[PDB]
């Protein structure tokens, strides 16, 4: 799975 | 300091 | 899903 | 210390 | 949106 | 879009 | 300046 | 190409 | 604590 | 060694 | 030093 | 592909 930084505000590490 | 993210929607960043 | 960090204090992680 | 990844499948993380 | 490092060369942060 | 960094005297960011 | 991820809980990008 | 952290376990910087 | 990528090879995310 | 993003403008990955 | 990206077509990296 | 690092300290990179 990819480890993708993400934000909608906080930044989070999404796991895809 | 830290980079923050915000919306105006478009995502934009700032530093504090 | 999202990688979460929480305080166990030492940092700990989960994925939801 | 460092974050490590493992599977239970879903990816999960730990700290060591 | 995703925050994805990218290169075509410089590295850049793409906002997707 | 691209996250840009520029000299504002400290670093500042914009997204295009 | 360095761009260092950190956490105390949210992740954030420190600007040092 | 994207520079995406990735894990199947080790993390690596994937070049896509 | 800082989240710092490092390598000794693939990478690891140090928690300092 | 540490892999640390930085910026003075471009982002770059420093090797320390 | 810093990692730099270049084309060979694949993206490749070097250190300076 | 993966960005890989080599070192016994100076660091060299490669894409596999
Ligand atoms: Cl996968
Ligand atoms: Cl500071
Ligand atoms: Cl430690
Ligand atoms: Cl599955
Ligand atoms: Cl989105
Ligand atoms: Cl917090
Ligand atoms: Cl701390
Ligand atoms: Cl591939
Ligand atoms: Cl190759």
């Amino acid at each position: 799975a990819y480890l993708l930084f993400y934000t909608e505000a906080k930044v989070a590490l999404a796991v895809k």
Side-chain angles (χ1 to χ4, degrees), chain A residues 1-2 4-10 12-16:
Chain A
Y2 286 114
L4 310 177
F5 279 111
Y6 179 83
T7 190
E8 285 187 10
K10 71 159 193 167
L13 189 76
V15 185
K16 308 296 296 196

